Structure formats: C-alpha cells, structure tokens
Design a protein around this motif. Structure first.
Motif, PDB file in Angstrom:
ATOM      1  N   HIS A 180       0.810  -1.211   0.000  1.00 16.88           N
ATOM      2  CA  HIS A 180       0.000   0.000   0.000  1.00 16.88           C
ATOM      3  C   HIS A 180       0.848   1.267   0.000  1.00 16.88           C
ATOM      4  O   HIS A 180       0.337   2.347   0.311  1.00 16.88           O
ATOM      5  CB  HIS A 180      -0.941  -0.011   1.204  1.00 16.88           C
ATOM      6  CG  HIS A 180      -1.932  -1.132   1.183  1.00 16.88           C
ATOM      7  ND1 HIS A 180      -2.629  -1.532   2.303  1.00 16.88           N
ATOM      8  CD2 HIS A 180      -2.346  -1.937   0.176  1.00 16.88           C
ATOM      9  CE1 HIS A 180      -3.427  -2.536   1.988  1.00 16.88           C
ATOM     10  NE2 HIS A 180      -3.274  -2.802   0.703  1.00 16.88           N
ATOM     11  N   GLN A 181       2.128   1.159  -0.357  1.00 19.70           N
ATOM     12  CA  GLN A 181       3.009   2.320  -0.491  1.00 19.70           C
ATOM     13  C   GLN A 181       3.094   3.115   0.810  1.00 19.70           C
ATOM     14  O   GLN A 181       3.314   4.329   0.797  1.00 19.70           O
ATOM     15  CB  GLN A 181       2.564   3.224  -1.644  1.00 19.70           C
ATOM     16  CG  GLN A 181       2.941   2.705  -3.026  1.00 19.70           C
ATOM     17  CD  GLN A 181       2.219   1.425  -3.396  1.00 19.70           C
ATOM     18  OE1 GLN A 181       1.208   1.069  -2.790  1.00 19.70           O
ATOM     19  NE2 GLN A 181       2.736   0.724  -4.399  1.00 19.70           N
ATOM     20  N   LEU A 182       2.922   2.438   1.943  1.00 18.25           N
ATOM     21  CA  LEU A 182       2.956   3.089   3.246  1.00 18.25           C
ATOM     22  C   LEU A 182       4.369   3.282   3.780  1.00 18.25           C
ATOM     23  O   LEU A 182       4.529   3.888   4.844  1.00 18.25           O
ATOM     24  CB  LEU A 182       2.138   2.282   4.257  1.00 18.25           C
ATOM     25  CG  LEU A 182       0.693   2.738   4.476  1.00 18.25           C
ATOM     26  CD1 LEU A 182      -0.043   2.863   3.156  1.00 18.25           C
ATOM     27  CD2 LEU A 182      -0.031   1.775   5.402  1.00 18.25           C
ATOM     28  N   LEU A 183       5.389   2.787   3.086  1.00 17.45           N
ATOM     29  CA  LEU A 183       6.756   2.787   3.586  1.00 17.45           C
ATOM     30  C   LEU A 183       7.634   3.683   2.729  1.00 17.45           C
ATOM     31  O   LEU A 183       7.650   3.556   1.500  1.00 17.45           O
ATOM     32  CB  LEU A 183       7.330   1.371   3.611  1.00 17.45           C
ATOM     33  CG  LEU A 183       6.501   0.387   4.429  1.00 17.45           C
ATOM     34  CD1 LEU A 183       7.035  -1.027   4.290  1.00 17.45           C
ATOM     35  CD2 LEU A 183       6.513   0.840   5.875  1.00 17.45           C
ATOM     36  N   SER A 184       8.357   4.586   3.382  1.00 18.46           N
ATOM     37  CA  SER A 184       9.289   5.445   2.676  1.00 18.46           C
ATOM     38  C   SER A 184      10.483   4.633   2.188  1.00 18.46           C
ATOM     39  O   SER A 184      10.926   3.684   2.840  1.00 18.46           O
ATOM     40  CB  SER A 184       9.761   6.577   3.589  1.00 18.46           C
ATOM     41  OG  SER A 184      10.919   7.206   3.069  1.00 18.46           O
ATOM     42  N   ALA A 185      11.010   5.021   1.026  1.00 18.58           N
ATOM     43  CA  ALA A 185      12.268   4.458   0.555  1.00 18.58           C
ATOM     44  C   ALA A 185      13.438   4.858   1.440  1.00 18.58           C
ATOM     45  O   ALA A 185      14.519   4.275   1.317  1.00 18.58           O
ATOM     46  CB  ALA A 185      12.533   4.897  -0.884  1.00 18.58           C
ATOM     47  N   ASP A 186      13.239   5.838   2.326  1.00 21.37           N
ATOM     48  CA  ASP A 186      14.299   6.277   3.224  1.00 21.37           C
ATOM     49  C   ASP A 186      14.852   5.113   4.051  1.00 21.37           C
ATOM     50  O   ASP A 186      16.028   5.125   4.427  1.00 21.37           O
ATOM     51  CB  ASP A 186      13.760   7.411   4.109  1.00 21.37           C
ATOM     52  CG  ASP A 186      14.791   7.953   5.087  1.00 21.37           C
ATOM     53  OD1 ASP A 186      15.314   7.184   5.912  1.00 21.37           O
ATOM     54  OD2 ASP A 186      15.063   9.173   5.030  1.00 21.37           O
ATOM     55  N   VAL A 187      14.018   4.110   4.364  1.00 15.34           N
ATOM     56  CA  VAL A 187      14.410   2.980   5.208  1.00 15.34           C
ATOM     57  C   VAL A 187      14.948   1.856   4.329  1.00 15.34           C
ATOM     58  O   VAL A 187      14.419   1.594   3.241  1.00 15.34           O
ATOM     59  CB  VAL A 187      13.228   2.481   6.061  1.00 15.34           C
ATOM     60  CG1 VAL A 187      12.586   3.633   6.825  1.00 15.34           C
ATOM     61  CG2 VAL A 187      12.217   1.764   5.186  1.00 15.34           C
ATOM     62  N   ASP A 188      16.011   1.198   4.793  1.00 15.39           N
ATOM     63  CA  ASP A 188      16.605   0.052   4.112  1.00 15.39           C
ATOM     64  C   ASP A 188      16.536  -1.182   5.004  1.00 15.39           C
ATOM     65  O   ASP A 188      16.657  -1.082   6.229  1.00 15.39           O
ATOM     66  CB  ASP A 188      18.063   0.333   3.726  1.00 15.39           C
ATOM     67  CG  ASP A 188      18.750  -0.875   3.117  1.00 15.39           C
ATOM     68  OD1 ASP A 188      18.053  -1.851   2.765  1.00 15.39           O
ATOM     69  OD2 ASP A 188      19.992  -0.852   2.992  1.00 15.39           O
ATOM     70  N   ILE A 189      16.344  -2.350   4.382  1.00 14.16           N
ATOM     71  CA  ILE A 189      16.169  -3.587   5.144  1.00 14.16           C
ATOM     72  C   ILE A 189      17.509  -4.219   5.515  1.00 14.16           C
ATOM     73  O   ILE A 189      17.632  -4.833   6.584  1.00 14.16           O
ATOM     74  CB  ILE A 189      15.304  -4.584   4.353  1.00 14.16           C
ATOM     75  CG1 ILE A 189      14.048  -3.904   3.803  1.00 14.16           C
ATOM     76  CG2 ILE A 189      14.921  -5.772   5.227  1.00 14.16           C
ATOM     77  CD1 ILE A 189      13.250  -3.155   4.848  1.00 14.16           C
TER      78      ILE A 189
END
Ligand SMILES: Nc1ncnc2c1ncn2[C@@H]1O[C@H](COP(=O)(O)OP(=O)(O)OP(=O)(O)O)[C@@H](O)[C@H]1O
Ligand SMILES: Nc1ncnc2c1ncn2[C@@H]1O[C@H](COP(=O)(O)OP(=O)(O)OP(=O)(O)O)[C@@H](O)[C@H]1O
Ligand SMILES: Nc1ncnc2c1ncn2[C@@H]1O[C@H](COP(=O)(O)OP(=O)(O)O)[C@@H](O)[C@H]1O
Ligand SMILES: Nc1ncnc2c1ncn2[C@@H]1O[C@H](COP(=O)(O)OP(=O)(O)O)[C@@H](O)[C@H]1O
Lengths: 536, 427
Positions: B206-215
């Motif tokens: 649902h596109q709720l996560l920013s690309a700013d965060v990395d796994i």
C-alpha cells in the motif's frame, strides 16, 4: 477332548526372535498340564499355575509376548485392562468393577466343572493400581480396599481353576509382597536386553517382506548392521529400518512447489546400504551406554606418537584388558594412572577404553554434577555402577578423582562420604561370571598415598612429560607448524639444554605464537618457552 | 492448495524439510508401495527450544496445511477434576472418534491431530514428584497405555511443545511412542532478513513505507535478536510513527488532515531500537554505563600495552580452532582500577553476546543460590556462536576473610570445574 491349541499354529508365524529359552520355560511351568491326556493329571492331584509377572527395561517387546500368547491360544478372546481404567467416583464401585468380569469363570466352573475353557485376563502396568498397603496415605483410601478385593477374589475360601492372569510393569520393586507369592502371581520372569545374535534375528525378522519382492540392493549386508548396532532395543532396530525406508522413498518426492511424486522413478525404487549407514549415524540414537560423540568430545585433537612412553602405556593397557577378558581367578581389576598436570591422562584413558571392544562402556566425569551435594553424587555413583553389573564385561573410567572429592590444600578440607563410598565400591566383586575394569586418573599421588587409597588399586602406571629437544622437534614436525627455516632456527637454539612441558601447554603456546606477525613469530614462541622454565 | 511461502514462517527450512520427510512421507507415497512394505506410520513429534522462536506458530500452520478434519486442542492442565477417575475419562474421550473411524473403515481413514501445549505441565518424570493425590502418575500411565497398548492405531499424530526438555519422562520418548524431537534455536542473519521481509509486506503493498528505510541495515544492525523481537520492534516503530500525526493531550482528537499521507522513516526505527525493545540474548548498554564511570584516560604506557594484549586474545578466540576456550586473569594491588578496564576490553570485542556477573546482585544469598546463578549465566552464554563473560572480584564471590582463613568450598569447586567445560561443539 478338544485341543486347547489352535490346529494351525507355528512358532515362526508369530514372529518373535531371540527369546526361545524364555518361551520354552513358561510353557514348561504353565501349559504343560493343559495338553496331556487328562487322566494322569486327574490322578496327579495338582492345581494349574495362576499368575505370571514380566518386568524389564522399556520398549523391550514385553507387550508383544502378551499379544501373541493371547492370539495363540484356542480359547475365548482375553479381557484387557488398559491400566487404571476401573476407578469410579461413587463409593464402593471400584470394588464392584474389579469383582465384575472375575465371575464368568465362577459361573462356568459351577456349571460344568473341571471341563471349562481357559479364561484370560490382562492388567497392563499393574503398578498404577496395586501398590504398598499402608503407603499412599492420601485420601479416600480406595486403593488399599481394591488391593484386598483383588487378593481375595483371585484366591480365597472360593476356588477357581480356569483363569490365567498376566501383568507387565516397569517398576517390579513397588508391588505388594503378598500378591507376588506362590498361589498368587507366581514364576516371576525378567525380560532382558538382547545380544548381537538376537539383534541379527530381529533384523532378519523385520526385513523379510522387502527381500521377497526384489526391493533391496544386494550391496547391503546384515553382519555389519548387527556389529555397529550396540546397546540397541528391538524398537530401536525397527525405527532404524523405518527411517531407512523413509529416506529412501523421499528421493522420489518434490516439495516447495506443492506436492509432486514422479511415477517413473517410483517403479525403480531401491534402498542403499550407505543410506542406511547415514541414517544410523544421523537420527537414531540409543539411550543405554555411551556413543561415539562422547569419545569425539573427550579425545579432541586425537593422539600423536612423540616418543616411546605412549606406546609403552598402550601396550600395558592392552595386556591389562586381555588379562581381564581371559582371566578367571580374578573377576575384578583396577589400574591407577599418574602424571603431572597437563600431560593428557584423560585422552589416553579414553583411547584405551575405546579400544577394548567391550559391550558396555561408560565415562563418569566430574563435570556432570555441578553444584550437587554429597548424597546426589553418591547416588549417581551407585546407579552408574549398578548398570554395569547387569552385563558380562565392562570398563568404567572414573576421571579426576581429586575433584570428585575436593582437596583444597588449606586445612586440608576433604568431604568424607565420597571417599569411603569409593574405597568400598572398589572392592565389591560383581555377581558370578561377570567382569569389570575400573580405570582411574589423578594428578596428585602423594595425597592419595596419605589417604591409604594407594593399596586398594591393583597396580599403577606413570605418564611423563616431554623433556628432550629431539622429542620436541618430533612433536613440532608431527603437528606441522613453525617448519622449514623456522624449524632450522628452533633446533639451533634448543638442543643445547633440556626442556620440561606437557603437550597441552605446547599446543596453546604454538597457537598464541602464530597469532603474532609473520616477521617475528619464531621470536615470540622461543621467548615464551623460556618464561615456562622449571624442573623436577 | 497449499505452498510453503503462503504460511509465512521464514528461516526454518531445514527443520520443516526433515519433519515433512519423517512424518508425512508414508502418507504421500502411493499406498501400493506401502502395502508391499510394512512402514507403520509414526505417531509422535516433540518440539523444544528457548522462548522467542515461536514454537506455537509452527504447529498452527502445519495443522492448517493438512486436509483431514480440524485438530483437537488441550490448553495446559485443562483435563483435571476433583472427582476420582475423571481426568482419565477426559483423556480417553480424545481417541474415541479415531477408534470408531478405524473400526468402520480401517485402512481408508483420515488423519487425526492432537496438540499438547506445555506438555511438561502434566507429563513429568514418574516416581519423583509428590503425587499426594496421585493424579499425575495415573495420568502418565493412562497416556502411556493408550498411546501404545495391546490395540494398535495408525491414524493419529501427537505434537508436543515444552521449554524444559528434561522433566519429560523417558518412557514416552522411545522410538515406539515419540521419534522425532526437534530443537528450535535463535535465527541467523538470513533468517532475520526473511522475517523482516514477511512482517513488512502489506505495508509495501500500500506504499505506506518510505524508501528512506533500508532492510539490509535493519538486518545487520540487529544481532542475536530473537525473531519475535523483530516483529515486536517493527510494530512498536510503526505505532510511534502513526502517533506523530495525532495531536491531543486532554481531549482526544484525530488530525484527519495530516492522516491523508502516512509513511514511516528511519528515525522511528532508530528511536524504537534505542528506547522501546530490549533483547534478552542480546547486549544492553546500561552495564557499560554503570561500570566505566569516569571513562578512560591514558596516563602512561602500561594502559596501551594492556589494551593491546586484550585484543590479541580476542583475535585468537575469534579466528582459531583446536582451542575453542581461552581464559585470562587480571590482577593488581587494591584501589588501582582493575575493574573498568575489563569492561572496556569486552566492549571492544564487538561480540554479539556480552554479560557481566557480579556479587552485587547476590548479596545475602546462600551457597546453593550462588552455584545456581553461576550455572544459569553460563548455560545462557552457551547458546551463541561467540560470547564474552566477565566475573568481577572472584575473591568476594568465594568469601575469604583472612582469619582462619574461612571460605566456602562449593563455589570454588564449581568455578574450577566450570572453567574447563567445552562449549557445545561448534562455538
Ligand atoms: N599423544 C597424545 N597424548 C595425549 N594427548 C594428546 C596426544 N596427542 C594429542 N593430544 C591432545 O592433547 C590433549 C590431552 O590433554 P587433555 O586435553 O585430555 O587434558 P588433561 O591433561 O588430560 O586434563 P586434566 O588437566 O584434567 O589432567 C587433548 O587435546 C588430546 O587431544
Ligand atoms: N585510565 C584509567 N584506568 C583505570 N581507571 C580509570 C581510568 N580513567 C578513569 N578511570 C576510572 O577509575 C575507576 C576504576 O575503579 P575500579 O572499580 O576499577 O577500581 P578497583 O579497585 O579495581 O575495583 P574493585 O574494587 O571492584 O576491584 C572508574 O571510575 C574509571 O572510570
Ligand atoms: N523379540 C522381538 N521381536 C520383534 N520385535 C520386537 C522384539 N522385541 C522388541 N520388539 C519391538 O519392540 C516394540 C514393542 O515394544 P513393547 O514391548 O510394546 O514396549 P513396552 O514393553 O514399553 O510396552 C515393537 O515395535 C517391536 O518391533
Ligand atoms: N520464522 C518466523 N517468521 C516470522 N515470525 C516468526 C517466526 N518465528 C516466530 N515468529 C513470530 O514470533 C512470535 C512467536 O509467538 P509464539 O508462537 O506464541 O511463541 P512461543 O510458542 O515460543 O511462546 C509470533 O509473533 C510469530 O509470528
């Protein structure tokens, strides 16, 4: 006139192996009276036997016997009591239950008399219900009533001669004395662990329906399987066979993309001896005795021959084991190893023990009872020695005596119970026709001399340290480190003096040395060796 | 319709493969080969392992995967009563349907499943516990007889779970009754990545996560972090993020306007790591703060030497075999500073698992308590690839007032034997 045995029966049909003597015995003291022409028996003035007890280690096939004896007989289907299933909440109904089902025999005896068909009753794990009278001072006391009811029902003012009871248990030391006596449960019988021949028989019995359809590769042979399988129970062998079958079949299945099973390789299914071996070493694991893992843990870095003393020690151990194996005047032997700390007594003990090829081995090490009290340690010693007595030849290696008992020099302070326990245990010969070896280790001889223990051991062996440059060079060569140029300089600066060190110490120092840079390693090592400078 | 990805349990591939091979193999292969064979099907599975690996989830999902009737559940010691001869009745009621189905159809019956959460609670070693009433031994006997009695069954499968795999009675863990027993341990880096991927799937959908965060950073930065704890962390950080939008102190209020756009940033995850979640088999920053109080100052050459020697030993333990255990002793005169330095060395070893044992948390205890605490700490340390354990002031841990002298021996023995105990092979 009708025979009590089914007209069609066979000892091979039932499918039990390795218990021929036991099967022969019971029949002799049991069914011998029920097959012969009745006339002599009526002239005989005898009453058939009533009651048999089977006690032994778990899962040893104890139950299989009951099933195939019930099946063999040409009589009514027996009645079974799956443990304590005869308990009722209402007052006086446990006694009614236990009394009910005991009276079809009464009715048929009072009806015909001396011609009634044999009755059969089963009481799985009798120990749940029958227990010491006056014990279990809990509430409602129903068990103490039920035991009396039973006692009276099976034997009392009233007589019965057409009932046979069978009970199996795992704790034969908890039953009421009375019950286990003449007239009542009689001819007490004990199921023991099998021998290698029994293992072969069981394996052949369980591997008969596979060879009969060309499903087994000719590669596999049973003699090896019987050899490696040590301290194994029939259930364990069956489980091993099942695991082999499962792993063999699994090759034809596909997972992670739903379930798929090819119907082409299916028709060429075959089992491999190597697969059997892999399964044996990977999953199945006995629970009686020791396993290869224990030795692999004790003797970590193996053994190396840096001199003749190790060979001498091994030869002496071989002579000792041979003597105990073949000697008959002396059913007991004992050997005390001695040496300074960090000589490796543990590994040499473990190796000599493993090489004996004995059935029952065991290693009692101090680091399995951390924080215990004296009583717990004594009970553990008792149990470990107790198990050995139930075999024919065995060897127990007690290690680190000066820890089992604590000799903190201050004081001195040493527990007293453990000492006496051991000093006694080491002179108690086992039952007739059995052999044991007790190999001990230590590192402080003089203390043992003071404790008047040194005269209980039969003999002694001495393990020295490395004390010569040539021996050190040989050890370094065998390990394969600080070699070539390095070796060239080490021999230069060492041969002109004497050394004194244990193998362990040498190993750790060698390791530490390598962890420095490759521009100064030899320097580091040689420097260290000096720091540890001493002599007797 | 079932697949291994759907379930969503990631990182236990080998254990699931082995369980499938050993417990669902004879039921999948065509029954013609099984007929020509004599492969009696297995009737026991046991699971054990430290808390936080979700032994239950496994069971739940595997039960779902089947397609032959829902399972029957027993919750702890639910089957217990005060009237005599009732718990056994409840036990017997469990197998009636399977018996009836076997009698009516025989070889054409479906699979029956039974699950025993905290099996240890009711099942325990016989002849030891004080069964004043005696229900425990009676229940143990009833189960043992029912599972494998004179009558034979082939369409039942029992799964048990327990965190204490010793109180279980030996008679139940022989090949006849329970064959497959499995340990579930802590996860590895790859398992951590797999879990984080799963838990954070709908969020990506649902596109709720920013690309700013990395796994990858999340996986690496978190070590000896129980998977459950990964889920916990994700949830906590999410909650923090979504709270940021709400503005209400006394009267509750929701700012729908700011709720039109919602996404989570690294800062929330960092704050959650710092403040909210505290692993157990991990490392904590409090102790280092509580021990090295005024920091470290280099007042002379010796300090550097000591530090250098320390790291040498660390290197040796990390990059060597044949010597999985190494121990070093520090000594000096009193009031000299021979405490903090050890903590600094430990903090510089960068090991995933660190622990400090002190007399501070044992004051007033008695001997047995002191031995038990030591054993527990070392037992916990035994479960990781690497570790670093500090013991401070061995002297007080033993008690040594010079008069007499007078000291306890039990503690000394313990520590002695202990120092020479191999870790579980491989660590
Ligand atoms: N020829 C050998 N003899 C003895 N040990 C050897 C030999 N070759 C290699 N080793 C290794 O040396 C070590 C032998 O000592 P070990 O570790 O058993 O302690 P120990 O000195 O017996 O113990 P303790 O201090 O309790 O007396 C083991 O690692 C063993 O693998
Ligand atoms: N370079 C340093 N070396 C040692 N201690 C330092 C240094 N710089 C600052 N300190 C401070 O010195 C104190 C060390 O006290 P510490 O407890 O080590 O003394 P101790 O007598 O060894 O302890 P204990 O009584 O527990 O044995 C700490 O507050 C530490 O921060
Ligand atoms: N002599 C034997 N022949 C065939 N199987 C045996 C024999 N002894 C033991 N077994 C195996 O042991 C298992 C039976 O164990 P059992 O005696 O019922 O355990 P328990 O005594 O605890 O009830 C069976 O799986 C069987 O294959
Ligand atoms: N491999 C895994 N992948 C994802 N989540 C997992 C995994 N293993 C465990 N968990 C999670 O950890 C938690 C375990 O809870 P539970 O099964 O009740 O624990 P336990 O049985 O150990 O007490 C759940 O949130 C579960 O989703």
């Amino acid at each position: 006139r009708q025979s009590i045995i089914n007209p069609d029966w066979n000892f091979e049909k039932m499918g039990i192996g390795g218990l021929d003597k036991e099967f022969s015995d019971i029949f002799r003291r049991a069914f011998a009276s029920r097959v012969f022409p009745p006339e002599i028996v009526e002239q005989m003035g005898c009453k058939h036997v009533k009651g048999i007890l089977l006690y032994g280690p778990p899962g040893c096939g104890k139950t299989l016997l009951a099933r195939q004896i019930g099946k063999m007989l040409n009589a009514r289907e027996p009645k079974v009591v799956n443990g304590p299933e005869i308990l009722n909440k209402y007052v006086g109904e446990s006694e009614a239950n236990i009394r009910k089902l005991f009276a079809d025999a009464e009715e048929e005896q009072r009806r015909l008399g001396a011609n009634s068909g044999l009755h059969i009753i089963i009481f799985d794990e009798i120990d749940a219900i029958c227990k010491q009278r006056g014990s279990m001072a809990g509430s409602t006391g129903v068990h103490d009533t039920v035991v009396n009811q039973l006692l009276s029902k099976i034997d009392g003012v009233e007589q019965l001669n057409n009932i046979l009871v069978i009970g199996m248990t795992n704790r034969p030391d908890l039953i009421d004395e009375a019950l286990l006596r003449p007239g009542r449960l009689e001819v007490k019988m004990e199921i023991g662990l099998p021998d290698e021949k029994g293992r072969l028989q069981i394996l052949h019995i369980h591997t008969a329906r596979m060879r009969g359809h060309q499903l087994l590769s000719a590669d596999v042979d049973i003699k090896e399987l019987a050899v490696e399988t040590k301290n194994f129970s029939g259930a364990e062998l069956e489980g091993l066979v099942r695991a082999a079958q499962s792993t063999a079949m699994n090759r034809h299945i596909k997972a992670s993309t739903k379930v798929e099973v090819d119907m082409e390789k299916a028709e060429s299914l075959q089992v491999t001896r190597g697969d059997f071996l892999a399964s044996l070493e990977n999953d199945i694991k006995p629970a009686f005795g020791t396993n290869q893992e224990d030795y692999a843990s004790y003797i970590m870095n193996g053994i190396i021959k840096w001199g003749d003393p190790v060979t001498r020690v091994l030869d002496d151990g071989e002579l000792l084991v041979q003597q105990t194996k073949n000697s008959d005047r002396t059913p007991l032997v004992s050997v005390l190893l001695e040496g300074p700390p960090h000589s490796g007594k543990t590994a040499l003990a473990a190796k000599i023990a493993e090489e004996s090829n004995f059935p029952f081995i065991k290693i009692c090490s101090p680091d399995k009872m951390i924080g215990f009290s004296e009583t717990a340690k004594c009970q553990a010693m008792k149990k470990i020695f107790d198990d050995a007595y139930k075999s024919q030849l065995s060897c127990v290696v007690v290690d680190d005596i000066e820890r089992l008992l604590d000799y903190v020099p201050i004081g001195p302070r040493f527990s007293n119970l453990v000492l006496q326990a051991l000093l006694v245990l080491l002179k108690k010969a086992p039952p007739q026709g059995r052999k044991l070896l007790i190999i001990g280790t230590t590192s402080r001889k003089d203390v043992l001399q003071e404790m008047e223990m040194l005269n209980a051991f039969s003999t002694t062996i001495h393990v020295p340290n490395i004390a010569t440059g040539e021996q050190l060079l040989e050890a370094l060569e065998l390990l394969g480190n600080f070699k070539d140029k390095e070796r060239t300089t080490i021999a230069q600066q060492v041969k002109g003096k004497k050394v004194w060190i244990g193998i362990k110490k040498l190993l750790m120092l060698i390791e530490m040395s390598l962890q420095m840079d490759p521009e100064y390693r030899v320097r580091k090592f040689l420097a260290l060796l000096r720091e540890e400078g001493a002599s007797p």
